[PDB]
Write a protein that binds this DNA or RNA. Structure first.
Ligand code: MG
Ligand code: MG
Ligand code: MG
Ligand code: MG
Ligand code: MG
Ligand code: MG
Ligand code: MG
Ligand code: MG
Ligand code: MG
Ligand code: MG
Ligand code: MG
Ligand code: MG
Ligand code: MG
Ligand code: MG
Ligand code: MG
Ligand code: MG
Ligand code: MG
Ligand code: MG
Ligand code: MG
Ligand code: MG
Lengths: 185, 74, 262, 118, 124, 76
RNA sequence: UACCUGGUUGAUCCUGCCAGUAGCAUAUGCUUGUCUCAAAGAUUAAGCCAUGCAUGUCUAAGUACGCACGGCCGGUACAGUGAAACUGCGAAUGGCUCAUUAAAUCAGUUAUGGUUCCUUUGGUCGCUCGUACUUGGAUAACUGUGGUAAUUCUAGAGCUAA
RNA sequence: UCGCACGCCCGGCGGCGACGACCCAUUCGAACGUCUGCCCUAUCAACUUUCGAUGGUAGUCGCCGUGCCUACCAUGGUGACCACGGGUGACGGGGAAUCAGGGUUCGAUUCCGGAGAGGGAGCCUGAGAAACGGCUACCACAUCCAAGGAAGGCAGCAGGCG
RNA sequence: UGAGUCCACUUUAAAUCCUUUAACGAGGAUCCAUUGGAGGGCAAGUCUGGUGCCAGCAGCCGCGGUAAUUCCAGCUCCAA
């Protein structure tokens, strides 16, 4: 009898066949397109897509004008609109089934930094996320898996404690300036 | 020097250990042909010895030794 | 077990206390008193978890031992005193009188009242006992044994007692058309008028209660408390007024008010 | 092993003892425990004999009757003070209560009085 | 450049104190100490800093915000009446004893063995 | 001879079993830094040695105590 | 994701099993840079334990003549702390394990109109028709003799309170 | 019974409490009960029964109802709808994993209830125990001893042997 | 830019860790990522040298009897 949670869940489920050539082709294209780290990054978004599609099928098995069905459908459409994958005019529970892993990976903060263009490459954007140069709503985001909301999309910029922004220069710049001033006198 | 009987050697050896635990060591001499036991604690300043067997003293000598080892570790 | 239980687990605590899971292993087990185990709410939870006046149980003990908390006209010095339904907690220095009425949900609500309302409270009687010399006795839900009552007061009625003298002023008889607070179960917190009474021999009786918005519902009489005649209550009611509107309408009343506030 | 009143042997007898019996102090409330005692009949199997002089003889022993040892405490109950000082039911106890002097080195001389009960 | 704001302000007459959640903004430096927190709350609320007790800071990620709880007593006598001795000893008006807990348990079990007045004579 | 903590106890038992007839048993305990204690044993001919660290004193001292209580007996 | 493949034959179609394939546990091997949580003597031995600790407790409100401290307004008892001790309550709660147990335990549903219940709260508590301005003597803590090799063993003699 | 403020009458009337209890309620429960539900096995087909088996009558005892027990009578009760017997590497459940839809396996494991402190049995105290960080006897294991005797129960926290 | 080093807050009953924060701190950024396999199921060498039904590999079929795509080593590649 101790006071703790013991609540956890695997966010990814491995496929049944380990060496499918077309599956490795599609996952390798996804990683090479959107700048990912491993196959687990594909599989966890695939399993969240599996959660959303299972909820969608469970709603479509329900009858029309059911209150639980209407509430859960409106809540899931609100969640899809606020994550910004599904459009605000397209929102209907029949259009959830026609949604794709590419459109889920488009809302990555790494991909959104690459689309806004403050970083050169996708992996260079991931380097900037790792090295803590950018912030979202006066909050430094260190992890590239941040699902950027549509309302919080426009607030992506460089952080204040950043040499690329308005801050102090880095260790290499300080060391080169100190070496130059020591060589000059 | 030769604190015999009992509790004189124990208090004196605990004083020797609490003076300095680093330079102090304890030696234990067992004899079976004559059959007696000897404890001597030194701290490289004075040496204090205890020379009796009396059967019952074996348990308290090993408890004192295990207490010294626990004070060396802790 | 070889005897009575004194501890209560945090998981084994009831749901309406809304105690959190991570902070503690044990829950504050209420002391014995005028209310049951799962019907009341303790003074330490009412003071620390809901009002947020104190941080710790030691601070709650300091508050109850400075002689500040006045429950229904008497100072209780216990942190685990069972404060149940229609209990009046008075705090003199802040000048705050609280009446423990349920909210529209299953939880109790922090309900501010006037001292004119805190002077009295309402209690449902459970049985009439004939004492040792032919003396009628009412047994209320908060264990008050009042003697020589009005003989029109029956088994399923309510009485408006006074806190200063412990005697009855008025009474509400269990009749059709009267209001109804539902004290227990899945309909805990509903307020509506009584539209039907169905008797059963052996099995327990049931009452159909109609909401003001037309939402009729059945409830057994063990969890039923009338609060006044007709559609006019004698107490003050919290916000929500005991309706239990749907979750979609709750989402609407949250979201539209949030977007209107900005 | 101590003796015990009312066992009527001369050897060693083990008996159940509880609260309210001799040669046993109960630790828990109502605790019973076997204890070993000796018979009340006096034989050679004894170390100590406890003797209480009831009647005083002709001569005077220098060990016991010569050294007079006073009471350690004084009467605290008002009825016992009345029985000691032959008092009535109306007279005072506060004036006739027995108070003890206290004197030692360093501290001041004091006189300490008991709280009269009843 | 250090800014202190207050949220959730409450007046406990039954505890004879004020209380609030303290939000500290400090760009360009580390977490400011509790002495500076007490001084800035003192010059804010126009009271002496001896009664202001602040504890429990949590610094957010990024490094521009902390959240801490603090109470403001009326007097030092009321603070010693209802304030925990450990947070009193954080500042130094109270000093707890240094008797270690296992040795106190050993002393209690040694006093349990000997019956009579000599329970005090067992200890030292 | 620097050995393991268990091998030290076995060779120490063998020292008493060899000294059941004649010979002294010398046990030297001292502080060791280079928390650790140096424990060495000598019969006069063959020396054994070990270093007991903090991780194994509860495992070591109890068996060492039973070894001493089983192997040392003087006069009644 | 409502999923297949290799293996009987010269080759084919079936039945058929074996082998893969993918998760949850249990142990082990290799390796391991950061961080938030987090199982952990259950499986065989509900086998055995040196050592230390885990249930004790006083308020203005049950007993204060241990100077163990301590104040002077004392003589109309007890200023005020407080060791120890008598008394009341807890120790029948909590913790550990699953040996035993197969309409037994236990889960849903019921009654005690077939029973008890410390505590808490609300009732009652001059209802009776017959020295009270307060009744009795033991005892612990205190003093003093000890017995045993030894116990959280206890006694005899003085005391003194509920 | 005990503690605090301290008043008014012609010595007597007075407040705020704490504590002590016959009885009635309330609460915490406890326990017997009503119906339904549990894995494998027929190489377990009949089981129980004057040593209570199934009922009646009248009692003992229990906190109460009852073959719980006692005295006298009746020969009854369960079973192929699997009783009885055996095994479980079976504490039960909420639940866990695998999963289309269906199922299969596990559940000692933080919550609820049951059982227990090496194996059984008996009892004081106490509202509540057949309690073992309570005793009383026997068996297994073990400590000191002066040989008369005394003392033990980590399936608690750490830790040790196997 | 961390990982580390480390003054100082904060954390906490007192500490530890996290977050903050000075000063150090990276070009083979040696501050070096391994675990299994490469005939098929099953993604991935008819590459090279030795062994010659011996060693061994192989969960199934099978490979090795002096040109081994299956062993043992190098290189290359594949799965995470
Ligand atoms: Mg064939
Ligand atoms: Mg073929
Ligand atoms: Mg298989
Ligand atoms: Mg870091
Ligand atoms: Mg670190
Ligand atoms: Mg075991
Ligand atoms: Mg055992
Ligand atoms: Mg328990
Ligand atoms: Mg079993
Ligand atoms: Mg079995
Ligand atoms: Mg279980
Ligand atoms: Mg088992
Ligand atoms: Mg038990
Ligand atoms: Mg028992
Ligand atoms: Mg127990
Ligand atoms: Mg135990
Ligand atoms: Mg190869
Ligand atoms: Mg293959
Ligand atoms: Mg291939
Ligand atoms: Mg192969």
């Amino acid at each position: 009898p101790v006071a703790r949670s013991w609540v956890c869940r695997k966010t990814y489920v491995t496929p049944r066949r380990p060496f499918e050539k077309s599956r490795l082709d599609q996952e390798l294209k996804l990683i090479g397109e959107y700048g990912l780290r491993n196959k687990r990054e594909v599989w966890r978004v695939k399993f969240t897509l599996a959660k959303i599609r299972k909820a969608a099928r469970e709603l479509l098995t329900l009858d029309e004008k059911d209150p639980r069905r209407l509430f859960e459908g409106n809540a899931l459409l609100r969640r899809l609109v606020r994550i910004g994958v599904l459009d605000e005019g397209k929102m209907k529970l029949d259009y959830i089934l026609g949604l794709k892993i590419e459109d889920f990976l488009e809302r990555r903060l790494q991909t959104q930094v690459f689309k806004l263009g403050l970083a050169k490459s996708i992996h260079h954007a991931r380097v900037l996320i790792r090295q803590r140069h950018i912030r979202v709503r006066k909050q430094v985001v260190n992890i590239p898996s941040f699902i950027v909301r549509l309302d919080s999309q426009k607030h992506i910029d460089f952080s204040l404690r950043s040499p690329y922004g308005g801050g102090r220069p880095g260790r290499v710049k300080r060391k080169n300036a100190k070496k130059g001033q020591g060589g000059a006198g | 020097p030769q604190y015999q009987t009992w509790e004189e050697f124990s208090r004196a050896a605990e004083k020797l250990y609490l003076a300095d635990p680093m330079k102090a060591r304890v030696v234990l001499k067992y004899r079976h042909s004559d059959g007696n036991l000897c404890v001597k604690v030194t701290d490289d300043l004075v040496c204090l010895v205890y020379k009796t067997d009396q059967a019952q003293d074996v348990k308290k000598i090993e408890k004192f030794h295990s207490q010294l080892m626990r004070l060396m570790v802790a | 077990a070889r005897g009575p239980k004194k501890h209560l687990k945090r998981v084994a605590a009831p749901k309406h206390w809304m105690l959190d899971k991570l902070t503690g292993v044990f829950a504050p087990r209420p002391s014995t008193g005028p209310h049951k185990l799962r019907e009341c709410l303790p003074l330490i939870i009412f003071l620390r978890n809901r009002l947020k006046y104190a941080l710790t149980g030691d601070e709650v003990k300091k508050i109850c031992m400075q002689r500040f908390i006045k429950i229904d006209g008497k100072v209780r010095t216990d942190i685990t005193y069972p404060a149940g339904f229609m209990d009046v907690i008075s705090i003199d220095k802040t000048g705050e009188n609280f009446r423990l009425i349920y909210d529209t949900k299953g939880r109790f609500a922090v309900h501010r009242i006037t001292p004119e309302e805190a002077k009295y409270k309402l209690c449902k009687v459970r049985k009439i006992f004939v004492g040792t010399k032919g003396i009628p006795h009412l047994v209320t839900h908060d264990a008050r044994t009042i003697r020589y009552p009005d003989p029109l007061i029956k088994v399923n009625d309510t009485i408006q007692i006074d806190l200063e003298t412990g005697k009855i002023t008025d009474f509400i008889k269990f009749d059709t058309g009267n209001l109804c607070m539902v004290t227990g179960g899945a309909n805990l917190g509903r307020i509506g008028v009584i539209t039907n009474r169905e008797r059963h021999p052996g099995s327990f009786d049931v009452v159909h209660v109609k909401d003001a918005n037309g939402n009729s519902f059945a409830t057994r009489l063990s969890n039923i408390f009338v609060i006044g005649k007709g559609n006019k209550p004698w107490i003050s009611l919290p916000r929500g007024k005991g309706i239990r509107l749907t979750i979609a309408e709750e989402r609407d009343k949250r979201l539209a008010a949030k977007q209107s506030s900005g | 092993f101590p003796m015990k009143q009312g066992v009527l042997t001369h050897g060693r007898v083990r008996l159940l003892l509880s609260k309210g019996h001799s040669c046993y102090r109960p630790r828990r409330t109502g605790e019973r425990k076997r204890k070993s005692v000796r018979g009340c009949i006096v034989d050679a199997n004894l170390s100590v004999l406890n003797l209480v002089i009831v009647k005083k003889g002709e001569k005077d022993i220098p060990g016991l009757t010569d050294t007079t040892v006073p009471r350690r405490l004084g009467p605290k109950r008002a009825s016992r003070i009345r029985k000691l000082f032959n008092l009535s039911k109306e007279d005072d106890v506060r004036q006739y209560v027995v108070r003890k002097p206290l004197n030692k080195e360093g501290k001041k001389p004091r006189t300490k009085a008991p709280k009269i009960q009843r | 450049t250090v800014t202190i704001r207050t949220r959730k302000f409450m007046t406990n007459r039954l505890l004879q104190r004020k209380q609030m959640v303290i939000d500290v903004l400090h760009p360009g430096k580390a977490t400011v100490p509790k002495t500076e927190i007490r001084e800035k709350l003192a010059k804010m609320y126009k009271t002496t800093p001896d009664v202001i007790f602040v504890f429990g800071f949590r610094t957010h990620f990024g490094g521009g915000k902390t959240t801490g709880f603090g109470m403001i007593y009326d007097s030092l006598d009321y603070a010693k009446k209802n304030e925990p001795k450990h947070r009193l000893a954080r500042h130094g008006l109270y000093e707890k004893k240094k008797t270690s807990r296992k040795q106190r348990k050993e002393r209690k079990n040694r006093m349990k063995k000997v019956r009579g007045t000599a329970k005090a004579n067992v200890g030292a | 001879v620097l050995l393991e903590s268990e091998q030290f106890l076995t060779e120490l038992t063998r020292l008493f079993q060899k000294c059941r007839t004649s010979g002294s048993v010398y046990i030297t305990l001292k502080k060791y830094d280079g928390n650790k204690c140096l424990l060495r044993a000598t019969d006069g001919k063959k020396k054994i040695s070990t270093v007991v660290s903090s991780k194994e004193v509860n495992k070591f001292q109890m068996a060492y105590s039973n070894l001493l209580r089983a192997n040392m007996d003087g006069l009644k």
